[PDB]
Amino acid sequence: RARGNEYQPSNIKRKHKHGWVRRLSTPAGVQVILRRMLKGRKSLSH
Amino acid sequence: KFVSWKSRTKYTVKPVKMRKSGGRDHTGRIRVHGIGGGHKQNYRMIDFLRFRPEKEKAPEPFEEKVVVVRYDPCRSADIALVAGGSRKRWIIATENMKAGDTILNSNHIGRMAVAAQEGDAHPLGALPVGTLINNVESEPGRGAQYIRAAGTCGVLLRKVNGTAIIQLPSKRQMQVLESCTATVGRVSNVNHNQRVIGKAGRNRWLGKRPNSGLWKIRPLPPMKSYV
Amino acid sequence: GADRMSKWTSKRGPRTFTKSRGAKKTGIYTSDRKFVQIKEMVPEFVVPDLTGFKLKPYVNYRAPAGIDTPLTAKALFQETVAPAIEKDFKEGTFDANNLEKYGFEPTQEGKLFQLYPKNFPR
Amino acid sequence: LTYCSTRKGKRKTVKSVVHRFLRLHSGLWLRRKAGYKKKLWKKSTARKKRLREFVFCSKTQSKLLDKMTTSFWKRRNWYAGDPYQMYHDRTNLRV
RNA sequence: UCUCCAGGCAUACGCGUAUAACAACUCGGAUAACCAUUGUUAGUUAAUCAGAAUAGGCAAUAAUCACACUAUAAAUCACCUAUAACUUCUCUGUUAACCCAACACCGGAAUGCCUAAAGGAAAGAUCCAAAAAGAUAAAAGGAACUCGGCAAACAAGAACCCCGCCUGUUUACCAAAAACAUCACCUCUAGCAUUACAAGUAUUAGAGGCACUGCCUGCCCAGUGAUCACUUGUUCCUAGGGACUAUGAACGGCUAAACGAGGGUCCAACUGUCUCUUAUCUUUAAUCAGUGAAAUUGACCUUUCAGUGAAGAGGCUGAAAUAUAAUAAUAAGACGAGAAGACCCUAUGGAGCUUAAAUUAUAUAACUUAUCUAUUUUAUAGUAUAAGUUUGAAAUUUCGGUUGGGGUGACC
RNA sequence: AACUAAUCCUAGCCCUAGCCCUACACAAAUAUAAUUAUACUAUUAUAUAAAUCAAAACAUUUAUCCUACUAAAAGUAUUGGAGAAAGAAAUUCGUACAUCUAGGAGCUAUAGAACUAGUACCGCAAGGGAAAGAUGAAAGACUAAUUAAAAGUAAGAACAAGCAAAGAUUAAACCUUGUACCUUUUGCAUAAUGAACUAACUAGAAAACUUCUAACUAAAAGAAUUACAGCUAGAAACCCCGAAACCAAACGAGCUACCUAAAAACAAUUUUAUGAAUCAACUCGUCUAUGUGGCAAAAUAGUGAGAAGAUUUUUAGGUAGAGGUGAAAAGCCU
Ligand SMILES: [Mg+2]
Ligand SMILES: [Mg+2]
Ligand SMILES: [Mg+2]
Ligand SMILES: [Mg+2]
Ligand SMILES: [Mg+2]
Ligand SMILES: [Mg+2]
Ligand SMILES: [Mg+2]
Ligand SMILES: [Mg+2]
Ligand SMILES: [Mg+2]
Ligand SMILES: [Mg+2]
Ligand SMILES: [Mg+2]
Ligand SMILES: [Mg+2]
Ligand SMILES: [Mg+2]
Ligand SMILES: [Mg+2]
Ligand SMILES: [Mg+2]
Ligand SMILES: [Mg+2]
Ligand SMILES: [Mg+2]
Ligand SMILES: [Mg+2]
Ligand SMILES: [Mg+2]
Ligand SMILES: [Mg+2]
Ligand SMILES: [Mg+2]
Ligand SMILES: [Mg+2]
Ligand SMILES: [Mg+2]
Ligand SMILES: [Mg+2]
Ligand SMILES: [Mg+2]
Ligand SMILES: [Mg+2]
Ligand SMILES: [Mg+2]
Ligand SMILES: [Mg+2]
Ligand SMILES: [Mg+2]
Ligand SMILES: [Mg+2]
Ligand SMILES: [Mg+2]
Ligand SMILES: [Mg+2]
Ligand SMILES: [Mg+2]
Ligand SMILES: [Mg+2]
Ligand SMILES: [Mg+2]
Ligand SMILES: [Mg+2]
Ligand SMILES: [Mg+2]
Ligand SMILES: [Mg+2]
Ligand SMILES: [Mg+2]
Ligand SMILES: [Mg+2]
Ligand SMILES: [Mg+2]
Ligand SMILES: [Mg+2]
Ligand SMILES: [Mg+2]
Ligand SMILES: [Mg+2]
Ligand SMILES: [Mg+2]
Ligand SMILES: [Mg+2]
Ligand SMILES: [Mg+2]
Ligand SMILES: [Mg+2]
Ligand SMILES: [Mg+2]
Ligand SMILES: [Mg+2]
Ligand SMILES: [Mg+2]
């Protein structure tokens, strides 16, 4: 079949998989946020 | 995130909604293969301590009335709703139980042998040698754990002092205190083994997934040459 | 493919997603899915009578602006409290216990308008 | 070998050279004969005598041993009662 | 107004102003007109559509028009007892030709209603070439075509071999199958509870094999005198003396049918597959107008023949030919241009897999001695650890050289 | 007689020196699907770094990585498949520019920071990550000029004949001579690689011994060293781009594989009443043609398979790489 359409948007999935609360739930996720803060990213998470 | 569905603390005769596993654990990984889907089923809380005297009552032999013998999705054997006093409780049904029958549950250890009527629960001391029994309990007051499948009967081989030898359905001999409670007769659905599944789809109804498609003595040095 | 930079508002997402736009709550949602508005929770505008009032939006360009002197605790204290204590000290009828006589408030509890923590809006 | 060491930034001696060869100050190197302690029961008497001797090294071997050791091993040592006292110098060498 | 086409309107999810008007005509739409583009201004209005007090007691009786029935896979708060409270409308969603595919992509995309009352336009203009694509028609013949009846047909019928029992499943993007699964049958493991197996218990569960069905073959189960006596057998005590024996493995030929986009074969019919091609229409082509890519490219003022040469020459040697430039066609050459192709060899380059490679191996599982406990007259049992021994779940590392293709033997 | 272009100088940056810091800069909102005014539901880093790599393999081992004053002792003692390599201490020396905020034989728009910006854009996510600007004192003087100047074109197509030139010639072409460049192949090119062209950028680096030039000289050196003409100082040296891999920690199941929960769809026609039959919707993908930078990074057009079930489909959740899932294709996990 034709590929390239693997993104099937869903806001509930997006915020649950990559959101603020998800990232702060684990120390590894908190370190992800710290790295993005040190780089200066405007968007720390979804 | 997996929470077991077995979270009900109070005994009831109301059927309980069961969540299926698929063979996974609380971790979420497969631990047992061949488990998936099937028909949705409801759990009926069985009571395996036949001699449970009712609340606020003395521990003496009592009788119960058989309301109905139902079909159990969760078991090979069939269950019977039995009523006595003001209490209803599900139990395992023997070979010949019918609706409206009366079954005894006795604490008394007969000094002499007690006549064996199928469906009545007596201590193994009361029973005479050779009587078929089912729903045996390893330890007094523990609750039935053995011979509770369809059609399975255990023979009471011997009694000496306060100990009896029970031959389990696998022919493995077990010993227990004669104070332990057993139910006379074999379990119902005596012809459960004669069933024919017939088609692959019927097994998938029962929550069984297909098997995988995937398809050691070491000689000692003296024998290594001669292998 | 999602937009990460735009704000998260109730217009976006599924119907189940809802959130406020910053309006203060005026009531409670009780059981039975019922909204019960509370009269006290609804702000009431205290509007004065403007009849006979001489102050208008603008001022004469010929009106002199004064020297800027922001009000301080000392300035307030001298204007209000100092004369009373000074007069009482000369008469000798002054004691530490009765500072409330001159306007001191030992505690803010029981006041409709508490200075700290503030319990009234602007 | 190590030309520039991490800690001191210097050349390093190959200690396996220092454990097998003697440098005379004139520039010569001494060594033993390989196998002089091996299987003496099957060697001829003349062969054993040849093995026991101390022998000099060639110009290329001397050049290699010079590269593999640092200057400390090339200095004058004034040992009292040195048995090689006379062999640190060359006499009547025209070349 | 006419000609023709036949998935439309809502909701969900998603999207985020693409909605509408005006003004612009730079950019965007693969061209114009016009705007889906730029700028400015506007917009989507809900108490019904949509989103957003406490403690006890307690339940046998599906659904399918639920009646009759049959079934098996066994299948959806309430109600009651007390306690507490004793009149309320704020907040949020609502536009659109829209989403996922780098694109105004012949793709992907759930539900309800309906099938034209809703929604749309295959042709920028012209011309009627070759080749290429698609549709229709065919004199006589009817598989003579071809690896093969592939494709097509005014046909769409019959039959048999091989394989697999069957319906299913699989290599997203070169394999859909004879492979995998499958009921049935067989082997092995396990006598037990509060997170899987399982709120289960040998007619159960797990691991794995294998078509079933019926029919054959028959490893095998000390001898001899008969429930019975001696010789054996096995143990001991010393060749003697005691002690003790107490249906079915391995296999096969096929239920024998049914079924199959499986692999072969045959007959009938049918035909432009072919003898042997043709005509017409559409697409493309070509001319005109607008817009405008790609691989590729040392430089080129870029010929033929014979020789030379690595099987090899537009360019070298010798003869010959030869005003200059376009347009449309052909594919012999430019070892024509592109791919992560094919084959072989090399590296003291990798990686996957398997073991009977070497080194290890508190993964498990056993044990022994300590240690620590209890008891015990030295014994038992146990065990937050240490040291051993046995298993090996795993881990790490390696693939010397000479040997047409190997096999082998050899050799260094 | 000029188009495309070209020219420019400062925005800032680099390395040191010095110096601890104490900046923690309206209201409101935010850990709930962050930035949503109030109760529901409790809250919490990691046991030893590994491997690559060196040992021309690899298996003990392999500086820094993994820091505790400079210089000397000393690359010495010691350690090491005693191999590759590793490597002290005792013991001597050191008041460091001091003062105040300084300095450059450092860069100048392909440089110097990635930076005009962690933005635009790309990715589900972790993450990756750009490009560019130029008038004058005044624009409240109409936005400046400057340059046969790059390739590319135009002004101005071509004229038998040939690596395109050279010798020439009165004469551009005619006549004569002449097998492109680089890299390799055996020193051989009609071989084989590489190059459309222009501009900018784009690859040899160290002092043990040796040589040359000087100071002083049985002594030389500004402490620790060498010395039977030595010793001290100077000068003189050893490239760039490119794998498949390996390990550690994060991020991923919105695709796909399987599972859990809650839901949905299946007309008509026959039937022994169903993993039955015919055939739509729907799911799949047999065969052929087209397409082959396509409409499409797997499609179109026909033709076909299943189509009440081991069916299909929707929403949310789950299992993660030493792993997961697998009706085993070593298939699938953006
Ligand atoms: Mg993609
Ligand atoms: Mg999906
Ligand atoms: Mg198998
Ligand atoms: Mg207009
Ligand atoms: Mg345009
Ligand atoms: Mg519009
Ligand atoms: Mg607009
Ligand atoms: Mg609308
Ligand atoms: Mg695409
Ligand atoms: Mg219409
Ligand atoms: Mg046309
Ligand atoms: Mg026809
Ligand atoms: Mg014909
Ligand atoms: Mg033929
Ligand atoms: Mg033929
Ligand atoms: Mg055909
Ligand atoms: Mg099959
Ligand atoms: Mg099939
Ligand atoms: Mg498939
Ligand atoms: Mg495939
Ligand atoms: Mg098929
Ligand atoms: Mg296929
Ligand atoms: Mg098979
Ligand atoms: Mg088939
Ligand atoms: Mg025929
Ligand atoms: Mg045109
Ligand atoms: Mg020409
Ligand atoms: Mg020519
Ligand atoms: Mg020729
Ligand atoms: Mg020629
Ligand atoms: Mg042509
Ligand atoms: Mg050609
Ligand atoms: Mg080629
Ligand atoms: Mg080699
Ligand atoms: Mg190595
Ligand atoms: Mg190797
Ligand atoms: Mg290696
Ligand atoms: Mg190692
Ligand atoms: Mg820059
Ligand atoms: Mg940059
Ligand atoms: Mg030019
Ligand atoms: Mg010429
Ligand atoms: Mg080649
Ligand atoms: Mg999912
Ligand atoms: Mg139907
Ligand atoms: Mg069917
Ligand atoms: Mg069909
Ligand atoms: Mg069929
Ligand atoms: Mg599957
Ligand atoms: Mg296989
Ligand atoms: Mg294979």
Which string of DSSP letters, residue by residue, matches B74-132?
A: T-SS-EEEEEETTEEEEEE-BTT--TT-EEEE-----SS-----TT-EEETTTSPTT-E
d(CA B61, CA D38) in angstroms, rounded, equals 100
d(CA B47, CA B19) in angstroms, rounded, equals 21
Q: How was this one solved?
A: cryo-EM
Is residue B76 within 8 Å of B150, Cβ to Cβ?
A: yes
Is residue B126 within 8 Å of B156, Cβ to Cβ?
A: no
Which nucleotide has its C1' atom closest to residue D14's CA? F85
Tell me whether C70 touches chain A (CB under 8 Å): no
d(CA B122, CA B134) in angstroms, rounded, equals 11
How far apart are the CA of A27 and the nearest CA of chain C, in angstroms? 23
Tell me whether C19 touches chain A (CB under 8 Å): no
What Cα–Cα distance (Å) separates residue B64 from each residue in B94, B111, B133? 15, 24, 19
Residues in CB range of B106: below 8 A, 6 or more apart: B51, B61, B114, B120, B121, B122, B123, B126
Beta bridge partners of B64: B103
Is residue A33 within 8 Å of A40, Cβ to Cβ?
A: no
What Cα–Cα distance (Å) separates residue B66 from each residue in B94, B106, C56, C95, D10? 12, 16, 95, 92, 100
Pairing state between β B87-92 and B62-69: unpaired
Q: What are the b/e assignments for D31-47, b being 16+ CB within 10 Å? A: eeeeeeeeeeeeeeeee
What does the block give as tokens for C55?
């102050």
Residues in CB range of B64: below 8 A, 6 or more apart: B82, B83, B84, B102, B103, B105
How far apart are the CA of A26 and the nearest CA of chain C, in angstroms? 22
| CA B214 distance to own-chain centroid | 35
Which nucleotide has its C1' atom closest to residue B35's CA? F259
Tell me whether C13 touches chain A (CB under 8 Å): yes
Which nucleotide has its C1' atom closest to residue B40's CA? E75
A43 and C4 in contact by Cβ < 8 A?
Answer: yes
Chain A CB contacts of C1 below 8 Å: 7, 9
Block residue for tokens 């204290």: C77
What does the block give as tokens for B59?
């521990």
Considering only CA atoms, which of B208, B153, B158 is closest in space to residue B183?
B153
* The length of chain B, given as a count of residues: 227
Beta bridge partners of B181: B123
d(CA B92, CA B119) in angstroms, rounded, equals 9
Residues in CB range of B149: below 8 A, 6 or more apart: B75, B76, B77, B169, B187
Interface size, chain A vs chain C, as Cβ–Cβ contacts under 8 Å = 17
Query: Which resolution in angstroms does this entry have?
Result: 2.8
A43 and C17 in contact by Cβ < 8 A?
Answer: no
Tell me whether A7 touches chain C (CB under 8 Å): yes
Residues in CB range of B65: below 8 A, 6 or more apart: B82, B83, B84, B100, B101, B102
What does the block give as tokens for C118?
């503030």
